[PDB]
Design a protein around this ligand. Structure first.
Ligand code: CDL
Ligand code: CDL
Ligand code: LMT
Ligand code: LMT
Ligand code: LMT
Ligand code: LMT
Ligand code: ACP
Ligand code: ACP
Ligand code: MG
Ligand code: MG
Lengths: 571, 571
């Protein structure tokens, strides 16, 4: 019931197009159901009057039927168009609405939901739902109307023959459903066995180095051969049941038709029916058969659409656990760029058992370079995720110029913070579009502005050296870039953003010699006159930093100047 | 032509089952094609003699038809079984033969071929090929025979009406193929546009952290909305062409049938034909129509099967670039376990541009522990891949007791070498089956032997602590184990193998305190009385090693004792 109201509201903006096409469907289906009745009358006319010339009647009827078909073709053409376009408009609304809900969700949601599932819900499930209220609804409506008129016309033509069909088909159908359920079981048994054998195959192929190492290729080959030779034994049993079922289905189908031809034939000779009347009944019986299969198919697709519906309403009505674009903004005067971690406790949502910060307190003063030092896996990169408010701490507070970052507008907060990652991420756009991404309006930035920041970032040389220049499509689906090239485009993107706070994640595994000089020069121009928090692995950056913070087991164990920290009581 | 001989040879072991079922198919199809001809004669009998009682004739004919259907059902049941089983036996041979060819290939082949493609070729393409010589062949044979008899019976019943159908259908069909080709183009245009929009969606969802960082969620939402709103415009144009095509197809189909009813109707009145004769012709015309669609479908599946055939014969006939189980074996007397790298040059096949070893010479003496020292990414793990002969060097030689490992049987060579990896690999088997994997005959090892090696490896405690004990299914698809637990089962597997040469890859990122003691004790028992080559990151192992080798830029830069290396001219 609550799912039905959601499906009705989905079709509601297209109600006039769908009703017009339903009108065309109703007409086409009803006028078409007249053909067995009128063909029954024409059959009896020829039979009664074999001596009469019907040339003018045939020509007048065929010219009449030609115009009816031309109208029928135009009606069907208009109907298909209205149904396809209505579905397209429904799917379009579902695509834009779903993608909007997804991007508004917190990072933690993406941590527990695979991109593949979100894309499957965006591609497959939106297509299902769209046609389920349109094309599927028309299919089930046509089949439902044709079964109704068909059964009614069977009882109209002959109540005796119709009651007979009604007493024979249901018992046969119930027995066929029991045989069909047994056949489904034997198929699962064969396909479970086959799945096991393919998992074995996939595991051994994927880990062929370990298989070689232990000289087990011949062993695995024979292990797999035994599994698939067993699948063959299960498939033989499934084939025997399927053969016996197709034989039983075929026999029953033929003997039911034969019973109607026989009973009908007897009723003809008894003067209860005519040859044409029997032809009507058989034609209507064939139509009901097709209409039953049509309703059956409609039901399968209705279920698939309802299943897809639940998966979409689940994301569309999902409220993010972190504010999207809501909170305060600070004026030019009260914003200085000072940050403060105060007794911060945090564990990732995917691994809540593993604590990252255990009473983490750090003061990053305005315009000062703070160097974050610690062992690999200590949780240095987690500091950047918390400052951008990708996640909220479990306990403690993160403050910007005395304000808890939870009170600020997150979109605004992130506009004041720039980041240059260990492994920069570039989308499959032009180099210019990737650089423009820094700006609050990437459409407003001029070609001259993209060139300026590219020169400062020591990127302008390799970019112009590319055949397409700034229009070179990069990312995964485009032209591949070196680590240092990606980093300089990231520095260009940061430069254009022009943040007061800058967060730097240095590479522990240092890049090439020629890159490492051009990148260090660009990083220094980017660090100038900004609040910098650097996760450093180079002794040159720690020495030049205003203060050094040592992260050991989720807490700041040591805090002071590089010289003061090195000149510890034990040295 | 060469593909046709391969398809014939594939069906050859099943030739007697397939020929028997073809015999049953031929009978069923031919006896069935008699029904429109005999129904035409019965129609004319009723018409000519309306005053005659046909009760006994009807009852005798229906009882006769009942027995013919019972034979027809039994023939169809036997045919389906023989076709399903024949295909199953063909697919089974294809599965075992393909998996055997895959596991026999060199590691470099797996480096350039994705497991997904190999599994798709093992699952999908084997199923296609199997039914293409069976079920598809029966389908195309039936359709081909029924179109032949159908067209022959159309010309037999009426050469005038058949010539008429033959002059009308081909021109209409050619125009429909041109419209169908145009419709395919408009569909690709819409689906190329939709693909672009989904790639954008997937990229942005997958990289939502970067999108948040630059506050571009609202920007991307509107970028995607614009792309899918454009897809809607292309889909509207595709729907207009599809509507006009379904209308044209429907009209033509109806007007062709109407032409035959009209021309036939006129020929009836002229005394050139009877009502029954026309019914025969129309029934045969409907059968040819279905048979044309049948041949068309058979052709699509023949092409799919030929495509899959080429992909399978490609791997089945592939000769590995490295010997599988061919070469010499050394006697107890001449095998001591001494290894020697001599001027080894090697670059991985996937990255040939990047050299790993540049004149690499190393002597690992019998019963001596050699510690391999070098920077991360220097190519220390590549030494283990070359010793197991997973790859062959480009230049230089690897020798075992003076013998080039290329002359030895690789399966035998690997039986004398054991490895304990940084990240051990366990299959989705029981713990016992994973341990038994060490033995040359994992079926021959007793429960007592698996328990012995488990005690030495300090693994017996946690294994027995598991609810299923040694029968606990581990790996990816089973119960998850800690790094130290996996390593101790790897040490148990190595212990059972009992190799003379042992290759150890220590973890640079050291595991937990409780594990690191139980693992170091088990590693020491495993190192005892063996030729050991350890890639060390712990100062305790380098100090206790007989000699240390420093790997710097694919060459052994320094070679000597830990004390001698530390007491270098500059220290
Ligand atoms: C694996 C696959 C399967 C493998 C194989 C499986 C096994 C195979 C076999 C299976 C079993 C087959 C069994 C076949 C049995 C039937 C054979 C048979 O009858 O043969 C001839 C048949 C001969 O009988 P007949 O006299 O020719 O015909 C009798 C009919 O009554 C003729 O009736 P009539 O001529 O008197 O006319 C009907 C009459 C009377 O009306 C009706 O009969 C119409 C009835 C329609 C009922 C519809 C009900 C729908 C629901 C309503 C309520 C809604 C829901 C309410 C609330 C529900 C609860 C919440 O019409 C009206 O009065 C009009 C009423 C309109 C309203 O039986 C035999 O001769 C014996 C042969 C035995 C062999
Ligand atoms: C998007 C979808 C599409 C949208 C719409 C597209 C547009 C729609 C329209 C398309 C175009 C439609 C055009 C329709 C034109 C036809 C209309 C027509 O004829 O109407 C009545 C038709 C009336 O003619 P009729 O006298 O009733 O029938 C004449 C027939 O000749 C009757 O012949 P007959 O009664 O004298 O009997 C035939 C005779 C003569 O034999 C034959 O005709 C049999 C011929 C069979 C030929 C099979 C050849 C197969 C290949 C052999 C060689 C193998 C390969 C060798 C090597 C190849 C190279 C490597 O049989 C034999 O001699 C037996 C020979 C057995 C051997 O035309 C008109 O009255 C004009 C109406 C105009 C409207
Ligand atoms: C696939 C599963 C198997 C299918 C089931 C097969 C069951 C057998 C079907 C037999 C059909 C013949 O059924 C037979 O029809 C005639 C004609 O209506 C009936 O005959 C009776 O009614 C008719 C009127 O309807 C009278 O003219 C006639 O005098 C009277 O005897 C028989 O009482 C009935 O037995
Ligand atoms: C397996 C094959 C099955 C084939 C179908 C069954 C055939 C059975 C043969 C017996 C039927 C012949 O039975 C006979 O049919 C004609 C035509 O309908 C009936 O005739 C009735 O309709 C015709 C019009 O069609 C009128 O001209 C006639 O005045 C009227 O009585 C006869 O009254 C009836 O006795
Ligand atoms: C979907 C695309 C459109 C479909 C194409 C439609 C084309 C029009 C079809 C018209 C059919 C009638 O075709 C007409 O048949 C009769 C009967 O055979 C022919 O009539 C001729 O031959 C018959 C014998 O065959 C003689 O009895 C008759 O005296 C003679 O005139 C006409 O010469 C022919 O014109
Ligand atoms: C859109 C609807 C189309 C419906 C199909 C076309 C109907 C056309 C109506 C005109 C046909 C009537 O034409 C008439 O048919 C009968 C029956 O075949 C023929 O009769 C012929 O066969 C019957 C047997 O069936 C014999 O009893 C008879 O001796 C013989 O001449 C007539 O010689 C012919 O003139
Ligand atoms: N999305 C996520 N879900 C769960 N755990 C995550 C995670 N992202 C990171 N982690 C884990 O959090 C821990 C600390 O993360 P982080 O990446 O911050 O540290 P680090 O930057 O100190 C590693 P390195 O020094 O090698 O770059 C790691 O053990 C990491 O695997
Ligand atoms: N199958 C493969 N194809 C291509 N390159 C590969 C490869 N396996 C390894 N490499 C590359 O070869 C180089 C050296 O490999 P290897 O794994 O031997 O070194 P290492 O063991 O010194 C790394 P670490 O010290 O971090 O464990 C690396 O740059 C690695 O990425
Ligand atoms: Mg990091
Ligand atoms: Mg390694």
């Amino acid at each position: 019931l609550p799912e039905a109201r959601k499906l009705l509201g989905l079709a509601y903006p297209e109600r006039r197009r769908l009703a017009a096409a339903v009108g065309f469907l109703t007409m086409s289906s009803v006028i078409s159901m007249s053909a067995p009745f009128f063909l029954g009358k024409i059959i009896d006319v020829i039979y009664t009057n074999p001596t009469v010339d019907y040339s003018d009647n045939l020509t007048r009827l065929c010219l009449g039927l030609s115009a009816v078909f031309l109208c029928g073709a135009a009606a069907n053409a208009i109907r298909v168009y209205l149904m396809q376009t209505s579905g397209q408009r429904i799917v379009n609304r579902l695509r834009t609405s779903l993608f909007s809900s997804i991007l508004r969700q917190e990072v933690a949601f993406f941590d527990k939901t695979r991109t593949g599932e979100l894309i499957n819900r965006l591609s497959s499930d939106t297509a299902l739902l769209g046609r389920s209220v349109t094309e599927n609804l028309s299919d089930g409506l046509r089949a439902g109307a044709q079964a109704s008129v068909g059964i009614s016309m069977m009882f109209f033509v002959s109540p005796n023959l119709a009651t007979f069909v009604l007493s024979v088909v249901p018992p046969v159908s119930i027995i066929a459903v029991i045989y069909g359920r047994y056949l489904r079981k034997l198929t699962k048994v064969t396909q479970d066995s086959l799945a096991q054998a393919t998992q074995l195959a996939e595991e051994r192929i994927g880990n062929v180095r370990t298989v070689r190492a232990f000289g087990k290729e011949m062993t695995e080959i024979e292990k797999y051969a035994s599994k698939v030779d067993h699948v063959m034994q299960l498939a033989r049993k499934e084939a025997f049941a399927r053969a016996g079922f197709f034989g039983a289905t075929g026999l029953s189908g033929n003997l039911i038709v034969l019973s109607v031809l026989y009973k009908g034939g007897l009723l003809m000779g008894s003067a209860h029916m005519t040859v044409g009347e029997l032809s009507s009944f058989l034609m209507y019986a064939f139509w009901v058969g097709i209409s039953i299969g049509g309703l059956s198919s409609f039901y399968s697709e209705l279920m698939k659409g309802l299943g897809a519906g639940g998966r979409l309403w689940e994301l569309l009505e999902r409220e993010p656990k972190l504010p999207f674009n809501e909170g305060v903004i600070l004026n030019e005067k009260s914003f200085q760029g000072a940050l403060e971690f105060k007794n911060v406790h945090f564990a990732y949502p995917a691994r809540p058992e593993v604590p990252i910060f255990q009473d983490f307190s750090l003061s990053i003063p305005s315009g000062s370079v703070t160097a974050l030092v610690g062992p690999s896996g200590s949780g240095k990169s987690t500091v950047l995720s918390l400052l951008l408010r990708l996640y909220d701490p479990a306990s403690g507070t993160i403050s910007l110029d005395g304000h808890d970052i939870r009170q600020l507008n997150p979109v605004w907060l992130r506009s004041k913070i720039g980041t240059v990652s260990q492994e920069p991420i570039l989308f499959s756009c032009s180099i210019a579009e990737n650089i423009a991404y820094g700006a609050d309006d990437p459409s407003s930035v001029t070609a001259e502005e993209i060139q300026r920041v590219a020169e400062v970032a020591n990127a302008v040389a390799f970019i112009r050296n590319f055949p397409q220049g700034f229009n070179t499509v990069v990312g995964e689906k485009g032209v591949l870039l070196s680590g240092g090239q990606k980093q300089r485009i990231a520095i260009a993107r940061a430069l254009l953003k022009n943040p007061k706070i800058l967060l730097l994640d240095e590479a522990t595994s240092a890049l090439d010699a020629e890159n490492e000089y051009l990148v260090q020069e660009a990083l220094d121009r980017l660090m100038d006159g900004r609040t910098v928090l650097v996760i450093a692995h180079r002794l040159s950056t720690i020495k030049n930093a205003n203060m050094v913070a040592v992260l050991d087991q989720g807490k700041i164990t040591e805090y002071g100047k590089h010289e003061e920290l090195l000149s510890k009581p034990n040295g």
